[PDB]
């Protein structure tokens with residue numbers, strides 16, 4: 001009788017063959033310009049702008065890039081399917097050391113050089129172009145949709161002009177100022193750096209305690225025979241630049257029997273270390289030591305005893321070796337006392353002629369790198385070296401050369417944080433104040449991200465903008481030699497900006513000063529000289545809101561954006577640079593909302609690097625699992641924290657994907673034969689039908705609410721529980737007899753099919769942002785779904801009203817299945833017990849007599865899948881709720897239910913179906 005059943009099959013395959021079929025889908029969306037079609041949708045209602053943070057145009061995509069673009073894609077697709085016009089122009093960060101360092105390294109490896117600035121910039125620009133195309137196509141292989149054929153590029157000439165015009169706005173508001181002070185200096189790239197370009201890593205260091213003997217006249221003033229202040233330092237390379245020893249104000253300093261002078265609060269620690277001897281002979285107040293003078297044991301130079309602002313007593317000695325050329329707090333102390341700023345370390349981190357001309361350090365050190373010289377310096381200290389250790393400490397390194405940085409007093413350009421400036425509304429505020437106010441108006445997901453960014457703004461220094469490399473946007477101002485000050489005249493600045501817009505920034509190197517000035521100024525061209533520093537690339541990316549959202553007047557999205565979505569490492573990076581520049585231009589953040597994610601890490605939670613051998617390639621991952629599995633893995637996991645890549649976790653995701661896919665296959669298979677005239681007329685739905693429609697509505701609200709708050713785990717868990725439990729476990733098991741053995745003309749079967757159609761419809765809508773290829777495939781294989789949803793393809797999906805499309809009555813009282821589902825669970829646990837004893841094989845062999853008479857007997861029979869409700873003859877078991885019997889019928893050879901009065905004879909329902917004309 002098997003061939004007399006309803007076939008109930010679909011062409012939608014159980015196997016996804018994802019690595020074969022996904023490229024076909026994505027190629028189609030590119031060929032057909034699906035993102036453009038999305039933006040053009042005629043019934044768009046509302047707008048949604050996600051502003052892409054631009055990856056650097058260097059190298060192939062990392063797993064973190066895929067995580068990022070997939071999450072953006074889910075968020076964007078969610079808004080599209082809610083009915084909005086979407087703005088999502090992806091972009092690329094094309095300048096900076098992330099590109100330039102690769103060129104510098106390749107030149108070195110080729111044993112070649114390239115000193116021509118235009119030709120050098122050309123090699124960098126060609127490298128960004130190459131990898132922009134590579135990353136673009138790799139992004140498209142994730143199934144993401146955006147304006148990838150018209151992306152934004154910081155190397156576009158109009159973009160270079162937009163960045164420069166952002167800088168112009170900073171300068172005209174009085175926040176762009178030169179400062180001279182020690183800052184981060186990367187000797188390996190001969191450039192200043194700021195915080196976002198520094199990576200702190202553990203590093204071993206010498207750690208030394210050094211005695212500076214007081215001069216004879218100072219010992220006479222203090223009335224002791226011997227006294228030497230002891231300092232602690234990890235940088236013997238700066239001892240040549242000492243000008244002072246800074247003490248804590250109004251603090252007691254102990255003089256030992258051997259003549260060492262240290263903070264009394266630290267004497268116990270230092271004597272236990274063996275730095276000084278244990279016997280204290282005299283105590284002195286630091287206020288009485290100020291303006292004594294000591295002698296540097298390295299070079300015999302005077303060192304002033306000074307009082308520092310906040311000298312610490314937790315480490316060291318309480319006497320701080322002070323080198324204004326190499327320490328920012330040292331520098332301010334030096335100026336307060338009108339001391340020399342000694343700085344004889346060149347741009348490559350090597351001692352220069354200054355050590356000879358000023359007698360700071362022996363001539364032999366000329367040309368030596370400061371880190372290389374330290375062993376010989378420590379040996380030169382002789383008896384003044386009281387103790388030498390080796391320690392480990394967290395130390396700043398250059399983000400691209402990975403070499404340790406140093407600090408060098410230098411003249412650079414800064415955006416000031418504590419300089420009051422005129423607000424757009426006419427009030428007066430500092431940038432720090434504006435940025436803190438602006439942070440409070442932004443929504444952070446998770447909300448903990450707010451305090452992370454806030455704390456950085458509270459604590460950050462002035463922002464050094466000027467870099468000494470060639471690949472970037474120049475700080476393209478002239479210094480008037482007649483004034484020694486920059487020219488911020490609007491006519492000059494807009495003349496340069498317009499040149500940049502048309503020709504790009506190459507002209508700043510190529511053109512003469514005269515050719516770069518408005519005609520009104522060319523007679524005075526001899527008085528002007530170009531600043532040749534370039535902008536921090538974090539200023540480039542900080543300006544994307546201006547260059548993309550503002551300068552295209554909303555065609556690429558609104559300013560402020562509705563959402564930005566990046567790694568939580570961008571609090572130190574793009575979030576902060578965009579926040580600061582937004583606050584100068586607009587006095588608010590250029591984003592309304594920040595969503596963050598973690599890092600992709602290995603099975604042990606560790607970062608992937610080539611030096612570790614734990615790198616999983618994005619290509620290998622997509623080839624193994626398929627992009628819809630990778631996308632589901634992202635969505636079905638706690639992406640705000642680090643995501644670990646392991647076989648075990650991807651296997652779990654594949655099982656989820658399989659369950660979703662097998663469920664959609666079953667639904668499609670079991671309404672494939674439905675007559676489409678059913679779609680227009682209403683149906684009489686059973687209580688179980690209604691229970692499922694009501695359950696589907698309740699869980700649909702919960703999936704949607706979870707997805708709205710970007711908690712895709714919570715929503716997918718709700719969806720998966722529904723498909724596993726109420727759908728597959730209860731409804732589809734109860735309906736299989738009718739779906740396969742009732743007549744196609746049976747109105748109860750047709751009503752089940754409509755429920756299955758409504759259920760697949762909701763599954764398609766909710767999974768469309770995540771498994772877009774798979775839902776596209778579902779629609780491709782189901783004509784009934786396409787008619788019912790009025791959908792040509794996945795991009796025509798909308799959130800449908802099941803009530804309206806099935807013609808449900810307005811005030812229908814919901815079903816209450818609590819009692820009958822409690823019976824079902826009790827029956828199934830009693831039935832499990834009888835299968836243990838070998839008494840019966842399945843529920844169909846049973847009759848049940850329910851002790852509660854209020855229950856609907858057909859629904860009991862449906863849900864428990866017994867063949868008979870009522871009393872029979874062979875008792876199997878008894879509970880307080882029900883008695884089970886052997887069903888007093890034969891098994892029907894067609895439907896396998898125990899409903900046949902005669903052996904091997906079709907039951908009454910089957911007999912009619914087999915007879916039907």
Ligand SMILES: CC[C@H](C)[C@H](N)C(=O)O
Nearest residue numbers: 053054055056093541574
């Ligand atoms: C948001 C990205 C930022 C701007 C930077 N290009 C990076 O890849 O880290």
Ligand SMILES: [Zn+2]
Nearest residue numbers: 892895907910
């Ligand atoms: Zn039958």
